Amino acid sequence: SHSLRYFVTAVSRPGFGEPRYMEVGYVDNTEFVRFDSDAENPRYEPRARWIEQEGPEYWERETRRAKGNEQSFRVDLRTALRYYNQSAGGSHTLQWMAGCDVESDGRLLRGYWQFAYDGCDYIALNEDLKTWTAADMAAQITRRKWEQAGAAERDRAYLEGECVEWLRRYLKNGNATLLRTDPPKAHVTHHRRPEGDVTLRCWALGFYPADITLTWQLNGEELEMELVETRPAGDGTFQKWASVVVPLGKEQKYTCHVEHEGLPEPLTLRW
């Protein structure tokens, strides 16, 4: 399935002036657009070649929508201060995620529309796309206002309508980039320890997208393993490693296994 998601952050800046306001758009977990109120003449900007095919109308309407959202977020921040009885002199953050997960057949699998204040859940549109979960009393006040306004109906119309429609358009126009894959290049490194035994480290490098499985097996059973979180290389590709400690001279009984959507089949390697 595929997803289109927007991640928005506002951070208040006590003293005088506008909060920092940021939006980022993703198709299946990769960034394609961004807006940042700290840029000099802030516009929605492309973050990949494929979306640059959109004309000046797209860029202008998106820039305008972001600036409209900046104003709603400014009002939101001040309201949150009043609901929590907080002072004007602290920094506070409001985050929002919205978007759609869509199946092969074009069905909307799940729509999202949810907010966090100071890093905690605030209010979320439920799976039914008709009711709101409110985390606390502040968010219950918001919920009653949104129930009276008919917010969920309008939100659901975006998530079922434009969100699905634009995702299909983006996949049509940009599927060469959005659906691209770079399989892992794997190798094993060998590190003698002071203790007289060996660390074998299985590296997966240069892969895209991020999801991967790395395992070690001994006599073809799984097992003892240290495993770093998947991390960016800085050039658009990802890295991971997994390691085990084995006897010197018995390295050959251990195999490293790599599964990734870019491979024609699972990779099996040894020292």
Binding site: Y6, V8, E23, G25, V33, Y58, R61, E62, R65, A66, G68, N69, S72, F73, V75, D76, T79, A80, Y83, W96, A98, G99, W113, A138, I141, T142, K145, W146, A149, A151, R154, D155, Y158, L159, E162, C163, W166
Partner: peptide, 9 residues
């Protein structure tokens, strides 16, 4: 294209 958060807290 992205959403509009027109309903305020």
């Amino acid at each position: 294209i992205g959403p509009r958060a027109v309903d305020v807290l």
